[PDB]
Amino acid sequence: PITGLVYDQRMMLHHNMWDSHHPELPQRISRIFSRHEELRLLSRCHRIPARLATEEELALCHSSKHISIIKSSEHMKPRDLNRLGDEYNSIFISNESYTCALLAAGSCFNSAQAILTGQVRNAVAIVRPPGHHAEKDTACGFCFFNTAALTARYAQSITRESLRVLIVDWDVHHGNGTQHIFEEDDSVLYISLHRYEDGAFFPNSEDANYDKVGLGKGRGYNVNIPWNGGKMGDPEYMAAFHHLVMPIAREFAPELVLVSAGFDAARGDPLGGFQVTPEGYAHLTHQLMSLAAGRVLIILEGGYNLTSISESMSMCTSMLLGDSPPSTPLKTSATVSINNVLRAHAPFWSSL
Numbered sequence: 001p002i003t004g005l006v007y008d009q010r011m012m013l014h015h016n017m018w019d020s021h022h023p024e025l026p027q028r029i030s031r032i033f034s035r036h037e038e039l040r041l042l043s044r045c046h047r048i049p050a051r052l053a054t055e056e057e058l059a060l061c062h063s064s065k066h067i068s069i070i071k072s073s074e075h076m077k078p079r080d081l082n083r084l085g086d087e088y089n090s091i092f093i094s095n096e097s098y099t100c101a102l103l104a105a106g107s108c109f110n111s112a113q114a115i116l117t118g119q120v121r122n123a124v125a126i127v128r129p130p131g132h133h134a135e136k137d138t139a140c141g142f143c144f145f146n147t148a149a150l151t152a153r154y155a156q157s158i159t160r161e162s163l164r165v166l167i168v169d170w171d172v173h174h175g176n177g178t179q180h181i182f183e184e185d186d187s188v189l190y191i192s193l194h195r196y197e198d199g200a201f202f203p204n205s206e207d208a209n210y211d212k213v214g215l216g217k218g219r220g221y222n223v224n225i226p227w228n229g230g231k232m233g234d235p236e237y238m239a240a241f242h243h244l245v246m247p248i249a250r251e252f253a254p255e256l257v258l259v260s261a262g263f264d265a266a267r268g269d270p271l272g273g274f275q276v277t278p279e280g281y282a283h284l285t286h287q288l289m290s291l292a293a294g295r296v297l298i299i300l301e302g303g304y305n306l307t308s309i310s311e312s313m314s315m316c317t318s319m320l321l322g323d324s325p326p327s328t329p330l331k332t333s334a335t336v337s338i339n340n341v342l343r344a345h346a347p348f349w350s351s352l
């Protein structure tokens with residue numbers, strides 16, 4: 001099989017003890033997996049085992065202080081879990097949370113190793129909790145450890161430190177944690193598309209504006225594509241890929257592509273309120289397959305409509321497997337955003 005897939009039910013264990021209906025649901029991953037079964041995709045994929053990230057692997061991106069706190073949650077009584085959760089922006093913690101975050105990251109290391117040692121060409125990682133808001137020193141926005149960031153460092157640690165890794169983050173929210181981790185790094189290109197609303201959208205920071213292009217040797221290696229006003233869908237995202245994502249990615253000529261693949265920009269998503277279709281995410285995946293000789297790992301981030309995320313992610317796996325892609329003027333604010341990013345990134349990317 002040319003595509004690997006990682007899925008472990010143990011990552012369902014993480015749960016919100018006080019709100020069993022919180023939208024970051026255990027069945028996010030089971031619903032995705034079972035849709036893979038329905039669409040006859042599981043039989044085509046090589047099953048990659050999950051495993052725990054080690055603490056030394058976590059230290060690739062996270063402080064020992066942060067690591068320490070999250071690990072301590074394993075032995076906390078309910079009252080302390082509740083207090084600890086409450087110290088961060090939108091986090092719940094149960095006693096299984098730590099183990100699940102380890103699994104999510106280790107699952108992605110195994111997937112990256114599977115791709116880099118030629119076991120598979122590409123892979124999809126059906127994991128939770130998500131990763132991309134987690135910073136070096138703190139959890140945030142349902143995220144404990146930065147799964148995609150760790151995977152990029154892990155990939156470098158088992159090849160060469162200078163391995164060029166692209167992270168495309170198509171979650172509807174900005175990956176503050178990913179940007180910050182790699183903000184002064186030219187070895188990891190970070191590209192994020194995200195609803196912004198001039199700062200009114202989570203995570204509610206100007207860090208996500210198109211003018212944050214990176215720092216030091218990192219200048220040009222942080223691309224933020226912010227949406228302001230309007231339910232963006234397939235047209236805006238395709239246009240963003242044509243004018244920005246792909247021209248820049250091609251020039252960077254990455255050796256591994258990581259997708260921070262939230263499906264919360266999908267039609268039906270209560271959190272995102274956008275309109276990207278499964279076929280849309282299919283075309284995005286197919287386009288990214290033209291980079292790094294096909295060496296793409298798709299990592300689940302957010303996405304809260306169980307039907308939308310299951311149909312979307314399954315469609316991405318279908319494209320990785322090499323199926324044909326399945327079959328509208330832009331909103332104005334989208335043209336505007338694309339044009340602003342083009343201007344901010346012209347200094348760095350001659351493709352633009």
Ligand SMILES: COc1ccc(-c2csc(C(=O)NOCCCCCC(=O)NO)n2)cc1
Binds near residue numbers: 142202264
């Ligand atoms: C009926 O319409 C609805 C509107 C909102 C919600 C809801 C549930 S919680 C939350 C929210 O926005 N919390 O703020 C934290 C965000 C972190 C995101 C995690 C991620 O996807 N990282 O990219 N919003 C539910 C229904």
Ligand SMILES: [Zn+2]
Binds near residue numbers: 169178
């Ligand atoms: Zn990310």
Ligand SMILES: [Zn+2]
Binds near residue numbers: 173193
């Ligand atoms: Zn994003």
Ligand SMILES: [Zn+2]
Binds near residue numbers: 182189218
């Ligand atoms: Zn960077």
Ligand SMILES: [Zn+2]
Binds near residue numbers: 173301
């Ligand atoms: Zn999200």
